Design an enzyme around this catalytic site. Sequence first.
Site, PDB file in Angstrom:
ATOM      1  N   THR A 198      -3.098  34.085 -31.410  1.00 14.71           N
ATOM      2  CA  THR A 198      -3.015  32.867 -30.601  1.00 14.71           C
ATOM      3  C   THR A 198      -4.184  32.727 -29.634  1.00 14.71           C
ATOM      4  OG1 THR A 198      -1.709  33.820 -28.793  1.00 14.71           O
ATOM      5  CG2 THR A 198      -0.503  33.018 -30.727  1.00 14.71           C
ATOM      6  N   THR A 199      -5.128  33.661 -29.730  1.00 18.23           N
ATOM      7  CA  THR A 199      -6.339  33.634 -28.915  1.00 18.23           C
ATOM      8  C   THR A 199      -7.531  33.784 -29.855  1.00 18.23           C
ATOM      9  OG1 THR A 199      -6.265  36.047 -28.584  1.00 18.23           O
ATOM     10  CG2 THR A 199      -5.293  34.658 -26.858  1.00 18.23           C
ATOM     11  N   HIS A 207       3.731  40.244 -26.256  1.00 19.15           N
ATOM     12  CA  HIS A 207       3.231  40.457 -27.611  1.00 19.15           C
ATOM     13  C   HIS A 207       2.848  41.920 -27.812  1.00 19.15           C
ATOM     14  CE1 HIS A 207       1.890  35.958 -28.117  1.00 19.15           C
ATOM     15  NE2 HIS A 207       3.186  36.128 -28.307  1.00 19.15           N
ATOM     16  N   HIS A 256      -8.446  37.054 -19.628  1.00 25.01           N
ATOM     17  CA  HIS A 256      -7.564  36.117 -20.324  1.00 25.01           C
ATOM     18  C   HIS A 256      -6.102  36.529 -20.136  1.00 25.01           C
ATOM     19  CE1 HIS A 256     -11.408  36.212 -22.814  1.00 25.01           C
ATOM     20  NE2 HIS A 256     -11.430  35.061 -22.167  1.00 25.01           N
ATOM     21  N   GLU A 293       4.580  31.069 -25.638  1.00 22.51           N
ATOM     22  CA  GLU A 293       3.744  30.403 -26.621  1.00 22.51           C
ATOM     23  C   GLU A 293       4.674  29.817 -27.668  1.00 22.51           C
ATOM     24  OE1 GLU A 293       0.528  33.305 -27.663  1.00 22.51           O
ATOM     25  OE2 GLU A 293      -0.538  31.985 -26.270  1.00 22.51           O
ATOM     26  N   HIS A 318       1.817  36.435 -21.985  1.00 19.15           N
ATOM     27  CA  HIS A 318       1.348  35.113 -21.603  1.00 19.15           C
ATOM     28  C   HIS A 318       2.414  34.493 -20.721  1.00 19.15           C
ATOM     29  CE1 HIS A 318      -1.495  35.271 -25.091  1.00 19.15           C
ATOM     30  NE2 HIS A 318      -0.507  35.980 -25.607  1.00 19.15           N
ATOM     31  N   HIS A 356       0.473  42.722 -24.465  1.00 15.13           N
ATOM     32  CA  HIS A 356       0.054  41.880 -23.360  1.00 15.13           C
ATOM     33  C   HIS A 356       1.082  40.776 -23.228  1.00 15.13           C
ATOM     34  CE1 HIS A 356      -1.487  40.077 -27.072  1.00 15.13           C
ATOM     35  NE2 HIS A 356      -1.220  38.927 -26.481  1.00 15.13           N
TER      36      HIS A 356
HETATM   37 ZN   LIG Z   1      -0.559  37.175 -27.231  1.00 17.29          ZN
END
Ligand SMILES: [Zn+2]
Length: 258
Positions: A196-197, A117, A62, A104, A94, A92
């Site tokens: 958010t996941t 994040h 992911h 995000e 995005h 991590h």
């Molecule tokens: Zn994140």
Amino acid sequence: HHWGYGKHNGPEHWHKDFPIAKGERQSPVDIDTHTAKYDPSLKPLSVSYDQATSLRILNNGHAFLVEFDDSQDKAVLKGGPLDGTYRLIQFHFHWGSLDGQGSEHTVDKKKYAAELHLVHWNTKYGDFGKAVQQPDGLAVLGIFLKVGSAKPGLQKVVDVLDSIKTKGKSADFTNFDPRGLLPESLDYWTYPGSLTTPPLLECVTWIVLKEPISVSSEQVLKFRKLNFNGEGEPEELMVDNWRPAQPLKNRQIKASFK
Ligand SMILES: [Zn+2]
């Protein structure tokens, strides 16, 4: 077979397996800078990463994660709107398929190329697993990335991505200093939200920095060469692993600056 960011398993489908996806305090959200309220009682953020101990970097299908030793108070976040000490466990990113998307959270509808994040958990709850089941269990520091000048401190991360191209791959990643990823200023907005996941638990107290950091096109390009798939199967580039903004509903965003 599970959740992802594709057309048939993307964010719009998550609610079927994780009902909380339509919850009251879901993240990310759009930050309306003119509706945010400056709160004088907000304390400066206290970031103590001088003794951080990174362990590994992993591709979980992911995104890629850089995991830290959280068995002691080595790298912690305090102050701000937080009560207590929060230990860093992993960070991590995005990112998008193009420089115009990837973050995000958005600021006045503006999207950034990527979002970093740094995840921390409240030590009062002992361990990460228990912390995610509490409304004040997690504290995530969000940092925006824009394409421009190269970020020296990020190069060690981009150079090892080649070794964890596919889902499941992991590699040793020691002596990485997360302080090299921080912007100059620590001014921030903050609001109560969620992860958010999946499983999208509403246990986060979000701390999004106003100042983005700059990374080069060459650096972000390397993020885009990773794969969602595991080795030996159809190649799917890992891009656009971001969830769109969710309804703010009954929540107010506070700012640490005027
Ligand atoms: Zn994140």
